[PDB]
Amino acid sequence: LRDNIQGITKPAIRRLARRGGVKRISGLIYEETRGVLKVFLENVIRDAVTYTEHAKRKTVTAMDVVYALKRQGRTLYGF
Amino acid sequence: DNIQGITKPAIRRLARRGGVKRISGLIYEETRGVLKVFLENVIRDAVTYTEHAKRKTVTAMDVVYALKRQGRTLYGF
Amino acid sequence: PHRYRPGTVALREIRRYQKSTELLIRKLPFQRLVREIAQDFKTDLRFQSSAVMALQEASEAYLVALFEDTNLCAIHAKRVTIMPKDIQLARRIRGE
Amino acid sequence: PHRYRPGTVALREIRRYQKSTELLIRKLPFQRLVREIAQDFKTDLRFQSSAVMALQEASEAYLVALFEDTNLCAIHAKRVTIMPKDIQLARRIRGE
Amino acid sequence: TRKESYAIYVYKVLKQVHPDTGISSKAMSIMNSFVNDVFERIAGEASRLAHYNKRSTITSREIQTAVRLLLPGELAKHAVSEGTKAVTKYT
DNA sequence: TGTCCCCCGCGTTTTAACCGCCAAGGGGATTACTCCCTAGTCTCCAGGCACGTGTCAGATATATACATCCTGTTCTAGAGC
DNA sequence: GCTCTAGAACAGGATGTATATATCTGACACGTGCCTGGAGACTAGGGAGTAATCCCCTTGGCGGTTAAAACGCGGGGGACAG
Prior knowledge:
Chain A: One of its GO terms (cellular component) is nucleosome. Chain A: Keywords: Acetylation, Chromosome, Citrullination, DNA-binding, Hydroxylation, Isopeptide bond, Methylation, Nucleosome core, Nucleus, Phosphoprotein, Ubl conjugation. Chain A: GO terms for molecular function: DNA binding; protein heterodimerization activity; structural constituent of chromatin. The structure is cut from a larger assembly and holds two copies of chain A, two copies of chain C (96 residues) and one copy of chain E (91 residues). The relative contact order of chain A is 0.09. With 79 residues, chain A is mainly α. Chain A has helices at residues 10-19, 29-54, 62-71, and strands at residues 24-25, 59-60. Chain C has helices at residues 8-19, 27-38, 49-76, 84-93, and strands at residues 46-47, 81-82. In chain C, helix 3 packs across helix 4 (84-93). Chain E has a single domain (1-91), classed as Histone, subunit A (Orthogonal Bundle), CATH 1.10.20. In chain E, helix 3 (60-70) runs antiparallel to helix 4. Chain E is globular, with a radius of gyration of 16 Å. In chain E, 12% of the residues are buried. Chains in contact: A-C, A-E, B-D, B-E, C-D. At the A-C interface, helix 1, strand 1, helix 2, strand 2 and helix 3 of A face helix 1, helix 2, strand 1, helix 3 and strand 2 of C. Strand 1 of chain B pairs parallel with strand 1 of chain D, so a sheet runs across the interface. Chain C binds a DNA duplex (81 and 82 nucleotides) through residues 1-7, 9-10, 26-29, 44, 46-49, 79-81, 83.
């Protein structure tokens, strides 16, 4: 399945901005944050799939994902 | 008194290297303060590194490790 | 047709989504987007539920922090509405 | 006498300080500042010359990058001058 | 104690790439620091990869994954190509 | 500072997400067993580290040429008598 | 129709960066004098590979229901500037 960048809906972006304390949200920022979320996701996902392919592993586990997040200096607690 | 030892033309040249056309008059003190904070952090790390080695002089080598452990690695030393 | 001010409900939603820790992006679209992104790297790749969960938590946290930084850029520029130039400036400051 | 417009001398200084890698910060004031900072942590502490050089290079590069981010924020705010609020915003985004 | 240096190695690499281009002592130190920093980063990533799946050894695949994790894009692809060509020439 | 375009707030629909249960087939974990490849040690020799030194790439510098800024000036257009 | 004010563009002079040697100390790198460190080769048993289930768990399939997203709509807000 392709064209899934539209899955991150505009109200979901608005909720993310409200959590960030944003009062006024432009209509042109939704494409930009979809782009940056996509870029961050390709970075983390490519690190995760390199971790997965290193260990003869075919399904991506939660451990590798958080290890990738930590090696990009964005360590995630709770997994 | 050595905090003011660095000069306003030195800060101007530093901003020129950073591609800044003009500098406001009240940013010199702020730049001096943030430079003092950065130097305090790096010097604290280097002091801990020097004290760990039972040494009384801060060599260049543990300084570049102190900078590199802060995500600011230095080359040439 | 009682109508609230355009900017009071914004602050109310800010308070509601800052107090609460419930996730904002729905799990299914994020999972589908993750599979779409990963299908270009490894063919027929499987994602466990906790992996997608952790990826979602990290992605929402990164987006939230970037949104605070862009909002701070907006107030720094004597502005309220965020614009993609704020996102570009925030990304380039951290060198992303 | 000859008069130059405000900015062309600034641009010339930018160019001449970006082509060359000379030491902008003088050796003695930076060395004295380093000794003053280090004297509060450890008394009778020495600094070899290459250590002072390395610390000065790291500090100058860090301050140049901070000034680049400060100018970037100033242009984002449609401003030519760089204000302490710009440095504060750049450090806050950079988490310093 | 004595300190290792990669002066001759970087020198011969440069002469293989540019046979008529010199290099200064400060640039030699910069290159040394760069190669040592990349070596430490790749070795740490490979050690983390080995510890990740309870492996006590570091093989060519560990360095391969470390390079793919650290080096981005076409730089990573060319690094894997050069490493694979070196291993195939060894065998 | 005025304003006309841009974003926000209820209304409506619809639209897909969350949920409840189950087949089900590819995939992570470890036990029995084996293997070839890896730590350690004996000897040493060709790659490698440290001191001497010729000089040519680079650094500092005067003088002189091409390039841009500027002030002087000549000319032509247009208002006044 | 005659007299005269003022804007406009090259003309030469001033100044700036830049090439061209002039030269000069200065360390680049070969030569050499060693030199320490892994190359060659047993010794062998510990980690990795192969399998061998094994399960397990994540993908997909029946929908049901409903919170939420997309659709314009309306008036207020305010972003981009002179």
